[PDB]
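Obj.: predict assembly geometry.
Materials: sequence records (below).
Method: joint structure prediction, all chains together.
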Amino acid sequence: AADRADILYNIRQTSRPDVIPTQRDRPVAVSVSLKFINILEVNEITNEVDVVFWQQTTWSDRTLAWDSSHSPDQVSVPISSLWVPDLAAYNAISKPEVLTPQLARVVSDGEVLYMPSIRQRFSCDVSGVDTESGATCRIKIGSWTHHSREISVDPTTENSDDSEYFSQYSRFEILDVTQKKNSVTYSCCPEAYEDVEVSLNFRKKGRS
Amino acid sequence: AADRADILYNIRQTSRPDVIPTQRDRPVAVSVSLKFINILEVNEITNEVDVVFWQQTTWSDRTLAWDSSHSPDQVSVPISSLWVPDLAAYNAISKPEVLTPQLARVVSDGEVLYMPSIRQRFSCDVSGVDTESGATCRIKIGSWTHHSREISVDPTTENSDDSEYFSQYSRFEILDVTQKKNSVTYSCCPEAYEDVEVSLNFRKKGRS
Amino acid sequence: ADRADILYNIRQTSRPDVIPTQRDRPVAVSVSLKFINILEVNEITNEVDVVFWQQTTWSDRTLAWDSSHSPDQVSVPISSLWVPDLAAYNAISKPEVLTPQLARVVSDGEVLYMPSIRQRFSCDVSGVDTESGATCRIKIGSWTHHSREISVDPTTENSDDSEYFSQYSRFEILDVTQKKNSVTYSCCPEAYEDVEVSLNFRKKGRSE
Amino acid sequence: AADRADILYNIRQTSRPDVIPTQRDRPVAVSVSLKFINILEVNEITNEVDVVFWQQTTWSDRTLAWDSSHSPDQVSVPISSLWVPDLAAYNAISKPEVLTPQLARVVSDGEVLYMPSIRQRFSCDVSGVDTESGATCRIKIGSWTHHSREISVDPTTENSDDSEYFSQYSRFEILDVTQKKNSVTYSCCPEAYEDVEVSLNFRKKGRS
Amino acid sequence: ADRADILYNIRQTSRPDVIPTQRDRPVAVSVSLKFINILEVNEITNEVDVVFWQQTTWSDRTLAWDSSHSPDQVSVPISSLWVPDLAAYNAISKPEVLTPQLARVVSDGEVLYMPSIRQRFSCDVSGVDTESGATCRIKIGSWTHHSREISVDPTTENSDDSEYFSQYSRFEILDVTQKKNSVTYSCCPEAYEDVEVSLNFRKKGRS
Ligand SMILES: CN/C(=N\[N+](=O)[O-])NCc1cnc(Cl)s1
Ligand SMILES: CN/C(=N\[N+](=O)[O-])NCc1cnc(Cl)s1
Ligand SMILES: CN/C(=N\[N+](=O)[O-])NCc1cnc(Cl)s1
Ligand SMILES: CN/C(=N\[N+](=O)[O-])NCc1cnc(Cl)s1
Ligand SMILES: CN/C(=N\[N+](=O)[O-])NCc1cnc(Cl)s1
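Observations (raw structure tokens):
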């Protein structure tokens, strides 16, 4: 059929990175799930935390679909060639440091999977981080300019070990992670903006 | 009967990011409003503060207008495809750090709203920041190259809560925030440059 | 024509990489540093962090147009026009431009470019804690154009040395003097003109 | 006989930087080998180490091959004109800092070689760094978005000293370096991602 | 042919990614470090923060032009020209060019580039606090071009060492010797020429 070069060419032909792939007249269903990899530099005085994580992002874009009958059903494409959710962490106090090659996976049916590793600083509750019950830091992520009728965010509830990929060499340890969906409204505008809230319950590891 | 692809497309046909959309001979009306999200660093000796805020900027651009009678009346567009006010913080001692996706919301009537979240350090009065009455840090923001006749800056007076969006985990707290208007002239030229004096009356949270 | 046409023509004539040497002779570039602040200062290492507005002027005949029935001046991205390759010889960090990179172009070809710069220099910091104060020398000039291509001369004028100096700074400006110079180097036989700006300052609140 | 220009041009005309050089659906065999050069900023408390190494990377793309009969059999080419494996250090806690020109080396038989010098922080076991047995820091490097069916990583078990290129001025010393191979699956996909695991064994040089 | 014409020409015939090899002979590139300032230093970790002007010269005939009735020198952005792919072999931080990135091109095809660079190296600092001082040796050369493709010779132009060094620094230059050398590895049989810049300095006596 066609080769990976043909698939990419077609993409750049039918893709519109600056236009949201609004299916029918309904918002794009962007799924977000954070995989905590490390917890660095914590300050209980300034309520700040340096965190490394994998932002597993997904959504569909039918304008990139193709017939993978006798050709590959998946390819890696630079995000600059694709439309990407304008996600932002509300309580983030430093721009996200993308530590991995910014490539997205695209399936022939239009399913897009972007999972960059991210290091970033947040302003959250760090209190009790050294107590047995630990602290609970809450990360809010969601579109920055698209409201509920354009983009919906939902956490892909996939029963897994909160610290499955979490470093064993960190001074801290995850106790639990729960991801809830929310929808806030602002005075700037009459519409609401969906967002996912990830609650990181961690603490400093004791001693033998 | 046009979709978002048409809107963005048409926008790029009439948009002149490097040209100021001055209607006839009157200046461009820019509404500026800062929404303090956090106060990270504060130095009583050097009188410097590291702040985080949502700079709500507004202005109209008729050349971007379009009939939305049968299409979305709004779309998010990269600020690189639109002209944007050359606002600057006169007492900033560090370059602005935009923590959010650089997208603007453009309304079918040409209205433009850009609200980036910024972290920036300033030089201002920090004295009394540890007192009951707290400290008052004023931030002067305005066009850097367009004088009063070309660009005008007015605060988006919207009597709301000063700390409505302020972080609760900060070591400081907002006492009050007033945003007035100013018109200062300089040496370079006899033209007067308009600015907005945001007065952030804040103090260190005392409860220990 | 409108401002769109003025900026348009500037894109046709302007050669951002071709020095506007008018009829075989150097280009007259004036430079005036408007010290705004003095941040971190180390006497042990002799290094200082300084914020200032580098007021740069010069003429580019190629840009001149007819302001008979059109705006006399327009702001244009410095990337759309030739700009001096000024450099600070005793600079120890890249020049951090805190303001929008726009220059003021007058219909007669006169160009004004005044960015706010945050930089770290290597200079005599000793005596900063004394009455006479310390004097820091800033040598600025073209990095690749010699005396026959660029002539850098301080915009001498009975201006106020502390006119725009932050009142909230830990230091106070005692005196600012600007001496012009012309040095030759061990690479080329030609002479490179420079401008030395002496910044006399000291700590405030010292025991009298 | 063709010269370097002709050769480069040939590469640009056939090379697909955003397309993996797959040969009949078999995966691209990618070889990795880190030549540690220096170890800096070690922290046994937080288990973080800064490492400087030469990531020797090798793979093939026979579509770029040419007849070096009477013409150069090798040329340097900007990696932006070539397809480069999207390798990533899974345990890195800082984006890679490339300290050298980003040029590759293409050989007349389609073999491509890229060896950038990198400085990067990692989260690994550091306990024992000040002991005779030293510490063992395992670094995992492998394709970030291409699974084993698309890319395969294999450590060149070539004979060479461990601290051969290692700085003698480093506060540490390499006791031994062993490169293994892995293939992990993730909650995203059923396919596996091959990665080379380098185990560095070093200890604080004790001049006693 | 005025400057606009010159630049146009250069920018139109310059192949930034194609090494300008004259016939079969390698490209003769000259390297000269002019230490402008020695910042932070650490004898414990053997690391120094140096500032130096990297004088780099070479030729590219393809850029030549008759300067009889026109200028014989123009400033051109290095991004428009092919530039030697030098790298400090023992650098532990990427080079911070603090000056405009422009080269000087003479009508004969001669190219001169001297950026001011601040960079951190890993080298011998032991004795920096003594009368003898320390000798930090910096090796610079091509990264991908071997001896047959590129050659680096330190401009033997007898000049002063601390000539442009900063007087306000905390250290002082005792001596500097640019020695040409060669380097080979177990990857490739070919050798890569480089320049060893021996920096002999010590802390200035506090008094
Ligand atoms: C997600 N939070 C927002 N506002 N808020 O006040 O929080 N969104 C509205 C916009 C932000 N930037 C543009 Cl343009 S419209
Ligand atoms: C804010 N201070 C100014 N002048 N001043 O003399 O203080 N602004 C005018 C300009 C700044 N940059 C250009 Cl170009 S015109
Ligand atoms: C400031 N020191 C110079 N030479 N020197 O020998 O010290 N400048 C001349 C040049 C700098 N870059 C080019 Cl190209 S020509
Ligand atoms: C300067 N040291 C080199 N190798 N070495 O093993 O030390 N150079 C060869 C190459 C550098 N980058 C590519 Cl691609 S080939
Ligand atoms: C390293 N962890 C991964 N998945 N996971 O679910 O943990 N990697 C697979 C991918 C990474 N980026 C894209 Cl796109 S697919």
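Conclusions so far: Residues 1-208 of chain D form a domain with the Acetylcholine Binding Protein; Chain: A, fold (CATH 2.70.170.10).
To do: check interface contacts against the pulldown list.
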